C-alpha cells in the first residue's frame, strides 16, 4: 500500500507527513500522485513547479 493500490487501498501522506490507509479512489490517486511530484519538493522549487503544471493540476482537481 506504500507503492501502488493493493486490495483497492493505498497509503498517502497527510499535511503533517504521516501515513493514511485510504480506498484508492480517483481523488486519493491524485492525492498520492501530488505527494510523489509536488508536495515532496523543497520550498524554493514549489512555486515554479505549480506555475509550470498549473493547467494539468486544474484539470485533475476539477475531474477527480
Amino acid at each position: 500500500t506504500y507503492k501502488k493500490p493493493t486490495g483497492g487501498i493505498v497509503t498517502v501522506r497527510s499535511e503533517m507527513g504521516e501515513p493514511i490507509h485510504k480506498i484508492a479512489t480517483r481523488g486519493v490517486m491524485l492525492w498520492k500522485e501530488f505527494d510523489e511530484t509536488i508536495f515532496n519538493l523543497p520550498k524554493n522549487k514549489l512555486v515554479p513547479t505549480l506555475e509550470a503544471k498549473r493547467d494539468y493540476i486544474i484539470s485533475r482537481l476539477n475531474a477527480d
Partner: protein, 64 residues
Amino acid sequence: IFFKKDSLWQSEHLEAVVDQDVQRTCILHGPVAAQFTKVIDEPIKSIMDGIHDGHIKKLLHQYY
C-alpha cells in the same frame, strides 16, 4: 493546505460533493481488515455478536 485540509467528512455527505461522485472522496480503510468488509447494511449488533458468539462457540469446544 488547501488540497489536504478537512478531507474526511465528504465520504459521509456525497450530497455536498461535485456530481455526488464518491470517487472524488477519501474513505479511510485498512488493507487487511478489507478482506472481511463484504456484506453492506448488516446491523452493528449482528457483526459484534457474530464475532463474540464465534469466540464463545470455539472456546466451548476447546476448554468445556
